[PDB]
């Protein structure tokens, strides 16, 4: 069984904070002003727990009759899910008078046409059905769907909470994790507990002895398929200190042998260059502008070797200002 | 448990007089309702401004009781197919329904510009065949994409984005009807967040009333999911590029705000920076829009935001 | 006749025939020894043997007769989009698994799952890769996915975590030239000295492109009479590579710096039909790797070449872009 | 008919320039069964289409020139009903899918599938292959892989850069350089001897060849126009005749160089509006204006460098825009500022 | 009713006024007001700004800056706005970029060339020119379809290269030979399946010194009558 389903926050106690959303939705229900809700944010913040707690509070024993739980990423099809929604809306019960709640997890995975059809369905059944939409990013949804849904943002979990959850998972699964590996995993996941759990499970599976072996940072980076900071630092050092031929050879060799895309290399180098102490602002201005231009040109295609040499030249030229 | 009636749905306009913006178009629609005999019309404008709502209000005024079955709304880009929606339109047109002599059945089509050649010709033929009892209203974003034969038969109405004054008037009316306690800065913040989006403004007002009760700037910004305008203003007006990048990293990128929200809030804030000369504001807006276009093309990285900040800082120091 | 591309014709049949990928082959053999085959992620420089190795592993797993029925090969880049690829995968998985015969069972393990191979998986978008991960999770019982890509970092973490990753080292120049020489001798291709080296240089070490270019050159040699040897000029013509003499003339015209002379030369160059993009690429290769230019000149010329390449990628007039690029370099 | 069309070579033996390419085509026609897919690239008006037709005549016979034109109707998605002009012969087809805009991929797929099903093989000639969309090129690669038994594609383009690598790997790259001035002079001499045109000296043909910039079609049409104006007797003092749009563009260049002001910019806008409305492409206008500006002898190196830089910038902007007059006026204004 | 058509004129006149771009006028009429002015009739505002931004006398010129530099910067921004508009109105449907298009096409060039209107606000000529270009492209497509079997060229090549010689072979003989050249003209038309409608359409494609309206009008009516009578009196290939 996946570790994402396990250790999932089952009650509001497991949620670190965000009681404001619960209180606002409770007031909406009490005052009879409940709109179509949209909960978005990183996975693991407690959107599902919050909505199921609200549904249990509203309905109680008839949760299975008044709540329809759907997942838009099931990929069954637009017509089948539309039929499901319509038959759930049409199955009114006299002994269970009241609005019916529909929960759609991972709605951001839908195509634009599916989202427009969902918005039309929401408008059609708004008289007796209330829709709750769960997504990872609100900007991935169509503007038509966004306007009709009241937006609630779930802030990313604090680093201390993520570390506590990681420690709980480690002690539950008897896994030993190096502090460097833990820092790398936290940095790569970027406040997403699902990524943490998936990477930990995969690393445990790949271990020859999942009970008496410690996961290193190299294992984490290999599992995530991410550029190691050591390689990026070596490339940056070669660019900054060595001449043009050596820098070009080093960049090409590193990003071809290790399978690092030029855009990912640019992102890593920009991340590293943030901590650099620059005596001139023009250095940072030139670096940022030129690297953004190169990345945008990369997104449209173009010559790969020319773009790599452009990156090298942009980094070299900016540092001429000290 | 009872019925749920959100403010955005309860206070949506029903009669024509409930619409705030587009004075000329609303006056034309009111005249059409007054003299009856609704001509075929094409309402065009940027999406999301509520073009279909105006014709819905016109249908409510014209028909009244018979609005339940005398009005059919459809989407031209329906996934069910153009043929099936055309068949539905034909079935509705052939449906017999008694009406007062001065009124006619109304068919509202959304995203009519998505229709291609042939389908538009068939719709024109259907409209001509049943013009005695059925009138057609087409809603589209680009009026030029509608074929000339359809445009000649219809009367063009142009719908524009609501101004801040209209949003303020609607919010004041809602507040008076709901005895909402508020401050001027709170309404200013709500109008600032919703750039002519009436539904977003009403939703934000409702959420602020529920969460805190008193509508002021702090509570509105706490409710609003966009980055806080003060943080964006500090990032933009910082005299040092390192300070701007640090503010970005700490307060916007690491707080889960997407790049789209960041650039939109930067665009909103730069427009209102009265301390800065308008030429510098226009240069900053140009850079912000360039990075917004880059983000919308699929880049959307943190490096683009850093470059935007670098260019803005370069502009500021002259 | 049984005409077949030389790339697919000379693919190694078994894992033991892979020359330089010792580490990946050893790890794959160890995995094959285990009764369970996890999802596989093949990454490395192009033309290293990723597809060859996965096909050899499939052959050793199934058998020559059963492997064709048990394999679906897709290219997520050349395909129309996500929907076509995912629907084809769904149809392949939903189809009943072919029953192995007695000979297949007694000669090969014949595992009860079918292998789906995706080529150029890194070119997929994030949404496409998430949909592919969902499809893999849905049908993980009976299908194992092998993703072939050049950059492992272009694959999202949720999809990459599900796959055991095998790294293919770039082929050594000696190994690639030996493979090309062996292919040429078997097909009786008369090649002059340095022709295979020129083919490898044009292909930038990509053995797939090198084999394709060698096959194309062999076809051209049949059309030309006298049965002469293939020469570097022919392969340069077939690959769309501007001759080095024209590049030297362009460099000298830039060095002289006369605007009118450069304009005249570019005007007379565009009449020969040579590609401007090839000229830009070769100028980049010449200038960047040249020891006669200092750091500042290369810093400026890298940005110049980048701007010219970005403008050429938008579908613009080659003459204007090339003239602007050559004029800008002459002012450095 | 016009001399450019009357004396067009109708066979591989009738070709007079680029002897190596003629020998290559003759060798190709000797083995029709194993004919590869071809991609011919080079400057405009160099004889690519003529060479393709000559190869088709060598393979199938003179019947390839018995051409009949028909319109094929295709029902696409959302019931868009399209018309494509297909020039056909009892042995081959000629299509220009770029005339359908972004709907080229579906037209190509439908028509190629129909041709393959209707079928040793039928050759399909695709004009302006470089302007095909990438989806259309992917569909072309799919049809090449699926229907290589019955379909042999002959793609003609002016530049091979927009062509995708998968297409290039499965096709034979043929480079067609523009003829030299001596070959153009020889062709024009043959034409004038056939038409019995008086020549004071052979240098007139050299001047015509130089003025055409290697474009054989342009040189032939210019020779015909000059002969008609001079009563079928060309003299050494006969001026070189240029098309109307080229004359207008040269006048615009002279006006821009002479006076740089806002009123001059307005009148340049009027001239550009006149040029664009009469089916003169924006890229052609920009290229001609730029190369006329660079030929002015009163401009120094800095002015010409600024002009070519602005030309590159606004050419990129033209390739990414909709309203061409905007970019053309921007380029002219920038040039006026740089000259002043 | 006419106020609807007058609205773009008023918007263009207000946006090109130099008073609202000074330091004092900016406070009274802020940037939000100008963007709102764009969003009123946003279909025509960029067109009107592009049409009328060369007819001003700039009062907002920076020291050391001439009128020509200001109009060059305005034209640069206008072309950028056109690119943004193309990206907006394509299949991508990026309607969130409307304020950016507003600034790039209407507000920034107006700020660059703001001043007193030296003349009158003229309606945009791009729509009529676009319609004319579409009509002539349809005519050229028809001519190319008719003459495709005789000419080895594309549509653009037919316009650029073949048409001058077709003019020399179809209209010039009438000027020097009168009605005696009708047979040769008809013979040339027959070789390319050119109808009399195609002959009329061909003469409309010429610009500058090659305009044929006055030349055709100067041709005697008897010559034209004989030409059309001889054309109608004989069968033609099709
Ligand atoms: N006499 C002669 N004329 C040629 C030769 N090659 C091309 N031409 C002429 O060049 C003109 C234009 O060639 P075209 O088919 O349009 O080539 P493309 O448009 O560049 O592909 C034709 O009308 C031919 O008359 C040749 O070898 N000999
Ligand atoms: N290690 C190797 N040993 C022998 N031949 C190889 C090796 N790697 C690649 N090749 C040659 O490359 C050709 C196909 O390359 P391919 O495996 O498709 O490249 P990629 O790694 O991009 O999939 C085959 O014909 C094969 O002969």
XYZ file of N, CA and C in Angstrom, chain E residues 156-225:
210
model
N 2.584 33.917 -54.890
C 3.412 35.093 -54.641
C 4.359 35.335 -55.808
N 4.966 34.269 -56.332
C 5.815 34.421 -57.501
C 5.048 34.918 -58.710
N 3.805 34.459 -58.866
C 2.965 34.947 -59.954
C 2.722 36.444 -59.831
N 2.434 36.920 -58.618
C 2.248 38.356 -58.430
C 3.537 39.126 -58.692
N 4.656 38.658 -58.140
C 5.878 39.455 -58.158
C 6.548 39.469 -59.526
N 6.519 38.352 -60.251
C 7.317 38.203 -61.462
C 6.489 38.135 -62.736
N 5.424 37.333 -62.750
C 4.710 37.079 -63.998
C 3.845 38.264 -64.406
N 3.241 38.944 -63.434
C 2.260 39.979 -63.749
C 2.810 41.144 -64.568
N 4.016 41.673 -64.323
C 4.524 42.724 -65.226
C 4.607 42.291 -66.683
N 5.080 41.073 -66.943
C 5.149 40.594 -68.318
C 3.764 40.320 -68.888
N 2.833 39.847 -68.058
C 1.455 39.708 -68.511
C 0.859 41.057 -68.882
N 1.192 42.104 -68.126
C 0.771 43.452 -68.490
C 1.362 43.869 -69.827
N 2.648 43.586 -70.037
C 3.275 43.948 -71.305
C 2.676 43.178 -72.476
N 2.178 41.967 -72.235
C 1.624 41.144 -73.303
C 0.119 41.304 -73.490
N -0.589 41.896 -72.532
C -2.043 41.967 -72.582
C -2.600 43.378 -72.678
N -1.868 44.387 -72.226
C -2.343 45.764 -72.275
C -1.498 46.655 -73.168
N -0.176 46.491 -73.144
C 0.689 47.296 -74.001
C 0.363 47.183 -75.488
N 0.082 46.002 -76.056
C -0.229 45.956 -77.495
C -1.425 46.803 -77.894
N -2.399 46.990 -77.001
C -3.551 47.823 -77.333
C -3.157 49.279 -77.538
N -2.106 49.737 -76.855
C -1.726 51.143 -76.941
C -1.042 51.471 -78.261
N -0.287 50.530 -78.822
C 0.481 50.783 -80.034
C -0.177 50.245 -81.295
N -0.975 49.183 -81.189
C -1.625 48.588 -82.347
C -3.129 48.816 -82.385
N -3.729 49.285 -81.297
C -5.165 49.512 -81.299
C -5.924 48.201 -81.356
N -6.917 48.137 -82.243
C -7.744 46.946 -82.379
C -7.053 45.820 -83.135
N -5.915 46.089 -83.777
C -5.211 45.044 -84.511
C -4.546 44.032 -83.589
N -4.408 44.350 -82.304
C -3.751 43.476 -81.344
C -4.731 42.602 -80.574
N -6.018 42.643 -80.924
C -7.014 41.852 -80.205
C -6.727 40.364 -80.356
N -6.372 39.933 -81.569
C -6.119 38.516 -81.808
C -4.943 38.011 -80.981
N -3.851 38.777 -80.933
C -2.689 38.356 -80.155
C -3.004 38.312 -78.665
N -3.755 39.296 -78.167
C -4.128 39.308 -76.756
C -4.981 38.091 -76.422
N -5.953 37.777 -77.280
C -6.808 36.620 -77.038
C -5.997 35.331 -77.107
N -5.034 35.260 -78.029
C -4.177 34.081 -78.111
C -3.363 33.902 -76.837
N -2.821 34.997 -76.300
C -2.063 34.911 -75.054
C -2.969 34.483 -73.907
N -4.187 35.028 -73.856
C -5.127 34.641 -72.808
C -5.501 33.168 -72.913
N -5.664 32.664 -74.138
C -6.059 31.271 -74.324
C -4.989 30.316 -73.811
N -3.715 30.673 -73.983
C -2.629 29.806 -73.543
C -2.591 29.638 -72.031
N -3.261 30.512 -71.281
C -3.260 30.447 -69.826
C -4.663 30.347 -69.241
N -5.673 30.065 -70.067
C -7.061 29.936 -69.615
C -7.524 31.185 -68.869
N -7.186 32.351 -69.409
C -7.548 33.625 -68.804
C -8.834 34.138 -69.438
N -9.846 34.377 -68.613
C -11.094 34.953 -69.082
C -10.987 36.475 -69.119
N -12.040 37.115 -69.632
C -12.072 38.573 -69.632
C -12.130 39.122 -68.213
N -12.797 38.406 -67.305
C -12.780 38.796 -65.900
C -11.367 38.737 -65.336
N -10.610 37.698 -65.697
C -9.219 37.613 -65.266
C -8.388 38.737 -65.869
N -8.673 39.111 -67.118
C -7.974 40.238 -67.727
C -8.252 41.529 -66.969
N -9.508 41.745 -66.573
C -9.837 42.927 -65.783
C -9.153 42.890 -64.422
N -9.111 41.715 -63.791
C -8.527 41.608 -62.458
C -7.016 41.802 -62.490
N -6.358 41.342 -63.556
C -4.900 41.418 -63.626
C -4.435 42.867 -63.611
N -5.117 43.735 -64.358
C -4.704 45.128 -64.465
C -4.847 45.899 -63.159
N -5.553 45.356 -62.173
C -5.759 46.037 -60.903
C -4.646 45.779 -59.896
N -3.669 44.943 -60.232
C -2.626 44.554 -59.294
C -1.381 45.425 -59.375
N -1.369 46.450 -60.218
C -0.161 47.218 -60.478
C -0.175 48.531 -59.709
N 0.999 48.925 -59.214
C 1.151 50.081 -58.344
C 2.224 51.000 -58.911
N 2.271 52.214 -58.370
C 3.261 53.191 -58.752
C 3.131 53.639 -60.192
N 4.251 53.649 -60.920
C 4.219 54.101 -62.319
C 3.518 53.139 -63.260
N 3.169 51.938 -62.804
C 2.539 50.932 -63.644
C 1.025 50.900 -63.494
N 0.432 51.911 -62.853
C -1.017 51.950 -62.715
C -1.659 52.002 -64.094
N -2.743 51.247 -64.262
C -3.363 51.063 -65.565
C -4.745 51.690 -65.676
N -5.240 52.347 -64.626
C -6.586 52.911 -64.681
C -6.687 53.993 -65.751
N -5.782 54.972 -65.709
C -5.804 56.045 -66.698
C -5.504 55.516 -68.094
N -4.572 54.567 -68.202
C -4.218 54.011 -69.505
C -5.404 53.276 -70.115
N -6.092 52.458 -69.316
C -7.258 51.735 -69.814
C -8.369 52.707 -70.184
N -8.574 53.742 -69.365
C -9.593 54.737 -69.683
C -9.274 55.459 -70.986
N -7.989 55.695 -71.257
C -7.596 56.386 -72.479
C -7.759 55.517 -73.719
N -7.881 54.203 -73.555
C -8.075 53.325 -74.714
C -9.419 53.639 -75.360
N -9.495 53.763 -76.685
C -10.781 54.069 -77.324
C -11.820 52.999 -77.030
N -13.070 53.440 -76.863
C -14.150 52.509 -76.559
C -14.374 51.519 -77.692
N -14.077 51.919 -78.930
C -14.226 51.006 -80.058
C -13.284 49.816 -79.931
N -12.053 50.056 -79.474
C -11.090 48.968 -79.318
C -11.578 47.971 -78.274
N -12.065 48.474 -77.137
C -12.572 47.589 -76.092
C -13.802 46.822 -76.561
N -14.702 47.495 -77.284
C -15.887 46.821 -77.802
C -15.507 45.721 -78.784
